[PDB]
Write a protein that binds this ligand. Sequence first.
Ligand SMILES: Nc1ncnc2c1ncn2[C@@H]1O[C@H](COP(=O)(O)OP(=O)(O)OP(=O)(O)O)C[C@H]1O
Ligand SMILES: Nc1ncnc2c1ncn2[C@@H]1O[C@H](COP(=O)(O)OP(=O)(O)OP(=O)(O)O)C[C@H]1O
Ligand SMILES: Nc1ncnc2c1ncn2[C@@H]1O[C@H](COP(=O)(O)OP(=O)(O)OP(=O)(O)O)C[C@H]1O
Ligand SMILES: Nc1ncnc2c1ncn2[C@@H]1O[C@H](COP(=O)(O)OP(=O)(O)OP(=O)(O)O)C[C@H]1O
Ligand SMILES: [Mn+2]
Ligand SMILES: [Mn+2]
Ligand SMILES: [Mn+2]
Ligand SMILES: [Mn+2]
Ligand SMILES: [Mn+2]
Ligand SMILES: [Mn+2]
Ligand SMILES: [Mn+2]
Ligand SMILES: [Mn+2]
Lengths: 349, 349, 349, 349
Amino acid sequence: VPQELIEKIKLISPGTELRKALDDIINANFGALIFLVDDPKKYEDVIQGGFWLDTDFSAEKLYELSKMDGAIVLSEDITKIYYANVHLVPDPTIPTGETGTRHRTAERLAKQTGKVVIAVSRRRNIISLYYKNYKYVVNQVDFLISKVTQAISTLEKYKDNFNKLLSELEVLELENRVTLADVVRTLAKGFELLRIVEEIRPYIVELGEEGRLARMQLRELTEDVDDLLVLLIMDYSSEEVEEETAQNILQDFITRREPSPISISRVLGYDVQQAAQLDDVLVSARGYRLLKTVARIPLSIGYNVVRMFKTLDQISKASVEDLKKVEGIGEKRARAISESISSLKHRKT
Amino acid sequence: VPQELIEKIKLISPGTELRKALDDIINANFGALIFLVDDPKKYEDVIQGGFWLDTDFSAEKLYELSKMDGAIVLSEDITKIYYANVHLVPDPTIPTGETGTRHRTAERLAKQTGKVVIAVSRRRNIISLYYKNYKYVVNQVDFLISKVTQAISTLEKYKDNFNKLLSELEVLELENRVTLADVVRTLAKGFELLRIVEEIRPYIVELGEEGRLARMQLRELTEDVDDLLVLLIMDYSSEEVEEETAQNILQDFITRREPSPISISRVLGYDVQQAAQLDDVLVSARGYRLLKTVARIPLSIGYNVVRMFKTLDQISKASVEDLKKVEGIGEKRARAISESISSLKHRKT
Amino acid sequence: VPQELIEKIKLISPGTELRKALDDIINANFGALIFLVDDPKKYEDVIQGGFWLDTDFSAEKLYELSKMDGAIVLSEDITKIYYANVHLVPDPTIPTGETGTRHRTAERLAKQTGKVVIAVSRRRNIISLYYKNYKYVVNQVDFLISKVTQAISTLEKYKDNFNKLLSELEVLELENRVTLADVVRTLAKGFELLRIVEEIRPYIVELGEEGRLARMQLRELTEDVDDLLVLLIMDYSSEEVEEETAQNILQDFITRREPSPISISRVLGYDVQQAAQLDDVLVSARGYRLLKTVARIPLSIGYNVVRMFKTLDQISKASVEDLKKVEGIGEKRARAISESISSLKHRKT
Amino acid sequence: VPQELIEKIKLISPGTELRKALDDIINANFGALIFLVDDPKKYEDVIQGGFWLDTDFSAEKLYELSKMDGAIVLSEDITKIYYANVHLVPDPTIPTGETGTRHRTAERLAKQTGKVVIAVSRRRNIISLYYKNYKYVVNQVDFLISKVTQAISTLEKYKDNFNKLLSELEVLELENRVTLADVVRTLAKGFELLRIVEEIRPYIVELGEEGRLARMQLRELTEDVDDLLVLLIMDYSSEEVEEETAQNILQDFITRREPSPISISRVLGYDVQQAAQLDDVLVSARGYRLLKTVARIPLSIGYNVVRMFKTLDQISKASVEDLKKVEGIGEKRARAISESISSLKHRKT
Ligand SMILES: Nc1ncnc2c1ncn2[C@@H]1O[C@H](COP(=O)(O)OP(=O)(O)OP(=O)(O)O)C[C@H]1O
Ligand SMILES: Nc1ncnc2c1ncn2[C@@H]1O[C@H](COP(=O)(O)OP(=O)(O)OP(=O)(O)O)C[C@H]1O
Ligand SMILES: Nc1ncnc2c1ncn2[C@@H]1O[C@H](COP(=O)(O)OP(=O)(O)OP(=O)(O)O)C[C@H]1O
Ligand SMILES: Nc1ncnc2c1ncn2[C@@H]1O[C@H](COP(=O)(O)OP(=O)(O)OP(=O)(O)O)C[C@H]1O
Ligand SMILES: [Mn+2]
Ligand SMILES: [Mn+2]
Ligand SMILES: [Mn+2]
Ligand SMILES: [Mn+2]
Ligand SMILES: [Mn+2]
Ligand SMILES: [Mn+2]
Ligand SMILES: [Mn+2]
Ligand SMILES: [Mn+2]
């Protein structure tokens, strides 16, 4: 959905005064045909008849004018009502796929002028927005809230399985018993999860002001996932990988590529043909995830620990004296690495 | 619900253009009577009057034609509108249980021709689909979404109790303190759970495109349960059982047989009359569940470990050298069995 | 809500054919006035005019007859339609609190005959059931489903806090560090929980067939709670208490008495004036809860263990030989008591 | 929303008989204009024509009178209907922002008299309440229930993250490895959580009687949070802080101040410029949270333990003899402190 159209869709989002008027018009089964332009003079030839009003906008005024036939002309910022009861006369030779004089007029006019034209069906109670060559049909709020609500429920289900997967991976990681299968399974869930969020965004956008709580739920559910998936990729790819590379991998499996177990294993740099092979490939975490999330060591300084110790297994065997010999690790950070790794080993294994 | 009818029901599932038209017709309290045939000529004798249109289908065109009396004739793939305003004249001596000329016409016509006939009640806003001798009344989406939503909530409740049961069984299993009561209680919950999924399927099917999120939730909630129930049956039945036998047992208690504690105990091969006996029967897990799910040992090679060691208790006491003597266990799989069983014992008991 | 009335309310519960007809009547804003009697002859004097039909009942027939003025007379089992378009003439000197000739007629007639009379308001879309001296207004399903859904959500919240309370009490119980405050807090949550279930029952009953999933959720959420509360009462009351006594205590705090911390402490047999005292009273569990739920020892035989050992603390210190000396404890049950108590101590403390 | 207006809003809250009448009026698309006064005589000059009724109030009577034009005059306690079909004539020179004679009349009249005037739009089905200079538009219940339901869902999400944060802080606290970052992160979640509750209150208030379950859910979800946040503030602020000071801090970050990590750190008395510094500041809990919540030591006597031992770390190293030397600690409370701290250390670390 192009950005220029998304902006127009916001004009009639729940919570706007225009939307309140359109909902009132629908509730009384008036129809409407609304032309949005900034200079009525430029459009003098497609606007005929009716009444020149040049008055300030309000939902009640729009409502009252929709009792009459014809079309209503508004300023584009929805602050002025210019015309009511007009006859719109766009070029008849412009192709239209609509049935019905009001909807056909609406499409032809939107195409001809590059402006927004809103049609409200009198007895079907549908709001159709036309802009340039686009047609957006407006969903009612209950439909949107239903979709969004179901989507969040689904995310809860995915997030639960993701946490369960990850907590099992933690154990394996602390005991150095991790296979590629374990990692790829965890990454796949994270990707699928973030995918759901992606597909639900346009519903949440269209909710406008009524989608605030939805956004907060989405945020509490998923905010820390992407950080985690990136660190998992830095911990388990075939060879050393910049955070940026890892973020790119993430972006791709969200959007362009399908998170199949083989696909992920191969993008991770492992030469696997068939999925049952993943059970057989042994891997060790580099240690970035634990270093950043638990030892609170910045990634930049984390590169050094990993450069020197190679694996988390080796980091966990290091004394505090051994750790200080890393460029950027003093007694404070050395203690943090040391103590938090042992605390996790004691408590989790 | 026969498969041939299920296909017809899909024609008017949420998300189809036909359904959008029927919903628009309902919203304006037009009625409708729609005859679906592939060759209008074959049916020249039940179709009378009206207008021959032979035009391409669309929701708006269907809407507009439903403003007129009589019936509308569509091609079966819903790509052509053949007729509007026709008088349908099926054989009057065909039995009908309907009241009202439009619904009676609809049933008689469906029976006589073997085709689909849709009746939309003008003021009751009901969509009735007739096909051959079947009558499907269409549920509105909000009703379906409500059912499906409640059903998923119920499944969450069952799934929680199932996980709690199973985690307690794990402890008992690791300490070799399992009674038949413990197993049968766990199996019963799993069966009841999978049963709910079965009963909710036709609701999710009828949702068509609007049931995508529901399907994903059902899948995240239950996908791994059946695997688990099968492995539990292989672990605790009276004598050795093929995976296929176990899958059959599962299928039955989902569908044909009621998962009573005594029923399950007896199908599991234990001679029990009254339920309080189950507390007294001591059992040991063969070890398949832990071998496949935790040691990632394929069932085929699992048969061998179990053939040699009989119980999970014995498998847990085996050294890594002892395990290698099993046909299909090398140092890698022997270590995995060994290490994962001890890790679970350390952490869970 | 008296039982005789509850039975009448079931006649128009969601899922009944009568209810389907009433919903169709409401959807078209017909009104209705329906008299339910088993012998029309007995009532010949309150039934005037209209048409004698003596025909089989169906929703469509009822619908069609509600298009006409007056009242419809049905058999009480809703299998026969006796009359349509009748003028009901109950004794005018019977007091009525209703406004409107149809509702006033309905109440007076219900009172005079002891039968059911249903009034459906033509433009308010309300279903009023009158029986003897009762008036039940029917809730629409969406309203009921909303209440029930909210109630289950609330129960989830209570149940979570109950589990958290109880798991903390388990720790204290295994370490013999339990105060009366800890117990009373746990009991209070359980009582409040079971109370919610009580208040939501009439909503679930009125849902009829559409309340099946609700019932299953209520059952999965709460089924084991009452058993547990009873065992807690047997474990912590001032002196020894029969299971029946404990069940009675439970019943009371659900229904008749308000579960205040002081109230519960005193019904439990502890002489406490002010709530902060509860922090100071040390108590020990008798051991019944752990004996029945974990050792799977029947209450009858549990009385003996407790008679001999007094507290769970003492039971946990007993050898297996010491336990066998209890009437009803052999080597099997002695091992179960012994082993499960130590397993819990190892894992939970 | 001023308190005097909130009281007026309660008059038409779900569950009131007035609200039931207004809903019936809306369902039939009658309009209404209702004037609430205690002495009709005082208002003889703005009330013209119509019928003097001086009769008792009921929803059905109000309904029936709304079938006629004009306005209805009620007593302020909604027990009397004084007038129907009257012509209200407030001073025309009073400014109004409304369109439409009924709404304009309503606002002008409310302003002129200081009384409540309710307007019900005939075809838009909106209830507008005017009182003095205020205008409250009434939300329909389904809209409110939707908001409230979404808000509780959101709170569940926040509460889950809060518990997870706090349980991790517990571990760090028991091992004396707490940074300011850990605390501030936990406080921020608690503040955001309590904030959501604050913003949702007016929705729950407007639900009136239909918001009972919502209130119970809000209460089960959040009741113990504020106590906990206060104790965290007493445990981690720069220097010693009275409970009252801490409660004040809480109140502020709920309402007046935005819970940014730097803002909280500084109000806590730590001189931090940029957020990454918080990772580097080491802190120790004073011990109040554990003393009150786990040792059940009253705050007053807690001041003394902390005065003598300074940190929880030191309290955990104290013998039972050492503890008794605190003013207000006898053998009972000394044992409780001692034993519960070690039980937590054993089980959590
Ligand atoms: N060129 C036009 N200019 C201004 N108003 C128009 C124009 N064409 C149609 N309308 C307005 O639309 C109104 C309905 O016309 P109609 O033929 O029913 O179209 P429609 O596409 O079927 O719309 P509905 O779905 O019925 O609301 C009539 C008129 O007030
Ligand atoms: N044989 C028929 N062929 C074509 N159209 C028919 C036929 N019978 C009825 N209709 C159409 O149905 C319309 C309504 O007839 P009606 O007697 O009210 O039946 P119905 O079963 O009660 O349907 P409604 O529930 O009112 O919509 C009238 C006519 O336009
Ligand atoms: N004694 C009666 N016997 C049979 N039908 C009656 C009787 N009284 C009223 N009705 C039926 O009720 C219909 C509506 O009467 P009405 O005065 O509007 O009562 P009501 O209580 O206001 O009902 P509504 O709320 O309008 O449906 C008229 C008539 O068909
Ligand atoms: N001063 C008034 N006194 C009593 N009743 C009034 C008064 N002004 C309007 N009404 C009542 O309101 C009714 C509708 O008038 P109207 O001009 O449509 O106002 P409105 O603000 O548009 O209300 P609606 O939104 O249509 O319900 C007519 C009359 O019965
Ligand atoms: Mn006209
Ligand atoms: Mn993030
Ligand atoms: Mn006709
Ligand atoms: Mn499966
Ligand atoms: Mn009449
Ligand atoms: Mn029970
Ligand atoms: Mn008039
Ligand atoms: Mn509190």
